[PDB]
């Protein structure tokens, strides 16, 4: 029940993602790799870039094989492209195994790498369905499971910062654990509650109810999952569908109304500050997301604090003060349970049993009045289906799946 060698194997800078050290090639070349449950490609910088201190040198690897195939991956806010191949991959502070995995060698990118994030690649931990160029490119975790005896499960403890902050010139350092192949009981307290993975593509889940300070938002529950809800270590914020975001902000504004913040704050474009150590946490409400349980008609709630959704940023010009960014934001692609949610909890990606576990994280940030919580069961007599069915494009329909 112990996985000591994998504890504290994640690092990062606040808001710039959590990375794990990996080696690629023979002999092993060290790279820091973003841990991303919201994508499904293993892709690494493989050429010089202003924001890279180092990169994967295919030519230096005796075990590298070229797949003679390129890949082009555009996102909303950036893009990367490169050449597909395979090589030997290991996680030094992970299981004592080495696997031959697909690797996209990133040769050109725009707005993908981040200055000072200290990572050089991305480890997509989601399913084949959303891999590029297509679902025939086996993701890393699938290879790991197929080639080794590693159980088909991983778990994440993301630990946020962290006031008072160490530094004024750089962003706050963060830490965490990625436990590959099991569950480490020292990383959580209390009960572990499981929600079904609705479909294996993203880690998609269903939210059945939302409360802000114990007040039901009272929307049709399909609105909470429009057009999907996913658990995503590669997103910083809690992102909410437009209508849900508007209702949440209205509610949080109402609770915190003793303080009149500029509109820029609610848009996540401006910091708000209090004198060191005087932040009035109690005027900001807790937020509860009820997730579908394993049993029909059951749910459980995960409850986060303002300490999760107000992100600390130490401004140089006002290091006298504790300043915060509002880290709930609008989505047009459904709910994204990012680091804002995940930093509250130990999260178990139980692929073997098509479910996601949540328990209170032994490292979550709290005060003496309130804690992040995982609580259940809650039962509802006559349950609506809260899942949304994405309109089927002819594009998507025409695909064959041999």
Q: Which residues bind ligand 1WP (CB under 6 A)?
A: 16-17, 36, 38-39, 75, 112, 114, 232, 234-236
Nearer to Ni ion, 397 or 400 (CB): 400
The reply to whether 149 sits near Ni ion by the rule CB under 5 A is: no
Give the residue ranges of DSSP H helices in 118-241.
140-147
Question: Please, what is the minimum distance in Å from the beta carbon of residue 6 to ligand 1WP?
Answer: 20
Question: Please, what is the minimum distance in Å from the beta carbon of residue 130 to ligand 1WP?
Answer: 9
Are the C-beta atoms of 102 and 143 separated by less than 8 Å?
yes
Catalytic position from the list 87, 142, 232, 350: 232
Question: Please, what is the minimum distance in Å from the beta carbon of residue 275 to ligand 1WP?
Answer: 30
Question: Please, what is the minimum distance in Å from the beta carbon of residue 121 to ligand 1WP?
Answer: 10
Question: Please, what is the minimum distance in Å from the beta carbon of residue 158 to ligand 1WP?
Answer: 9
The reply to whether 399 sits near Ni ion by the rule CB under 5 A is: no
Q: Which two tokens stand for residue 257?
A: 């109304």
Point out which span in 274-282, 314-322, 356-364, 394-402 binds Ni ion (CB under 5 A): 394-402
Nearer to ligand 1WP, 97 or 114 (CB): 114
Nearer to ligand 1WP, 158 or 247 (CB): 158
Point out which span in 236-244, 248-256, 300-308, 392-400 binds Ni ion (CB under 5 A): 392-400
Give the residue at shortest CB distance from Ni ion. Answer: 400
385 is catalytic: no
For the chain, what is the total number of helices (H) and then of strands (E)?
A: 6, 26
Are the C-beta atoms of 119 and 53 separated by less than 8 Å?
no
β partners of residue 378: 299
Catalytic position from the list 36, 184, 321, 350: 36
Are the C-beta atoms of 364 and 343 separated by less than 8 Å?
yes
User: For residues 287 and 307, what is the distance between their CA atoms, to the nearest angstrom?
Assistant: 11
Query: From the list ligand 1WP, Ni ion, none, which binds 400 (C-beta under 5 to 8 Å, kind-based)?
Result: Ni ion
Nearer to ligand 1WP, 61 or 177 (CB): 177
Peptide bond preceding 346 in cis form (omega within 30 of 0): no
Query: From the list Ni ion, ligand 1WP, none, which binds 241 (C-beta under 5 to 8 Å, kind-based)?
Result: none
* Positive/negative CA dihedral, 365, 121, 337, 250: positive
User: For residues 94 and 106, what is the distance between their CA atoms, to the nearest angstrom?
Assistant: 24
Nearer to ligand 1WP, 142 or 211 (CB): 142
Question: Please, what is the minimum distance in Å from the beta carbon of residue 402 to Ni ion?
Answer: 6
Q: Which two tokens stand for residue 346?
A: 């130990």
Nearer to ligand 1WP, 22 or 286 (CB): 22
Query: From the list Ni ion, ligand 1WP, none, which binds 232 (C-beta under 5 to 8 Å, kind-based)?
Result: ligand 1WP
CB neighbours of residue 384 within 10 Å: 10
What one-character DSSP code corresponds to residue 364? -
Nearer to ligand 1WP, 212 or 230 (CB): 230
User: For residues 273 and 89, what is the distance between their CA atoms, to the nearest angstrom?
Assistant: 44
Question: Please, what is the minimum distance in Å from the beta carbon of residue 401 to Ni ion?
Answer: 8
8 is catalytic: no
User: For residues 225 and 223, what is the distance between their CA atoms, to the nearest angstrom?
Assistant: 5
Are the C-beta atoms of 230 and 204 separated by less than 8 Å?
yes
CA atoms within 13 A on the CB side of 146: 9
Q: Which two tokens stand for residue 123?
A: 């480890």
What are the CA-CA distances from residue 27 to residues 52, 107, 218, 264 (Å)?
21, 21, 57, 50
Nearer to ligand 1WP, 112 or 141 (CB): 112
- Cβ contacts of residue 122 below 8 Å, gap of 6+? 33, 34, 36, 39, 41, 42, 43, 44, 234
Question: Please, what is the minimum distance in Å from the beta carbon of residue 398 to Ni ion?
Answer: 10
Query: From the list Ni ion, ligand 1WP, none, which binds 236 (C-beta under 5 to 8 Å, kind-based)?
Result: ligand 1WP
User: For residues 222 and 48, what is the distance between their CA atoms, to the nearest angstrom?
Assistant: 45
Q: How many residues does the chain have?
A: 402
The reply to whether 400 sits near Ni ion by the rule CB under 5 A is: yes
Query: From the list ligand 1WP, Ni ion, none, which binds 234 (C-beta under 5 to 8 Å, kind-based)?
Result: ligand 1WP
Please give the residue ranges that form the binding site for Ni ion (CB under 5 A): 400
Could you give the residue numbers annotated as active site?
36, 232
């Amino acid at each position: 029940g112990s996985f000591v060698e994998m504890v504290d194997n994640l690092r990062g800078k606040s808001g710039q993602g959590y990375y794990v050290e990996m080696t690629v090639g023979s002999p092993p070349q060290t790279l820091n790799i973003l841990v991303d449950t919201g994508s499904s490609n293993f892709a690494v910088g493989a050429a010089p870039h202003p924001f890279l201190h180092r990169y994967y040198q295919r030519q230096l690897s005796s075990t590298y094989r070229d797949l003679r195939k390129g890949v082009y991956v555009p996102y909303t806010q950036g893009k990367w492209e490169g050449e597909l191949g395979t090589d030997l991959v290991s996680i030094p502070h992970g299981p004592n195994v080495t696997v031959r995995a697909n690797i996209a060698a990133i040769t050109e990118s725009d707005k993908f790498f981040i200055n000072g994030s200290n990572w050089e690649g991305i480890l997509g931990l989601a399913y084949a369905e959303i891999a590029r160029p297509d679902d025939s490119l086996e993701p890393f975790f699938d290879s790991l499971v197929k080639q080794t005896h590693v159980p088909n499960l991983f778990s994440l403890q993301l630990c946020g910062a962290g006031f008072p902050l160490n530094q004024s010139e750089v962003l706050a350092s963060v830490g965490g654990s990625m436990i590959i192949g099991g569950i480490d009981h020292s990383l959580y307290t209390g009960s572990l509650w499981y929600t079904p993975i609705r479909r294996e593509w993203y880690y998609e889940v269903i939210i059945v109810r939302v409360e802000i300070n114990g007040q039901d938002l009272k929307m049709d529950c399909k609105e909470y999952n429009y057009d999907k809800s996913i658990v995503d270590s590669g997103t910083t914020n809690l992102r909410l569908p437009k209508k849900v975001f508007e209702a949440a902000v209205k509610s949080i504004k109402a609770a915190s109304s003793t303080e009149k913040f500029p509109d820029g704050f609610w848009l996540g474009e401006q910091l708000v500050c209090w004198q060191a150590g005087t932040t009035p946490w109690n005027i900001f409400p807790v937020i509860s997301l009820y997730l579908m349980g394993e049993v029909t008609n059951q749910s459980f709630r995960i409850t986060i604090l303002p300490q999760q959704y107000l992100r600390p940023v130490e401004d140089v010009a006002t290091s006298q003060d504790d300043c915060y960014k509002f880290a709930i934001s609008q989505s047009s692609t459904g709910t994204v349970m990012g680091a804002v949610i995940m930093e509250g909890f130990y999260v178990v990606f139980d692929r073997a049993r098509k479910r996601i576990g949540f328990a209170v994280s032994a490292c979550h940030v709290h005060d003496e009045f309130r804690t992040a919580a995982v609580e259940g069961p809650f039962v509802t007599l006559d349950m609506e289906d809260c899942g949304y069915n994405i309109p089927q494009t002819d594009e998507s329909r025409s695909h064959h799946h041999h």
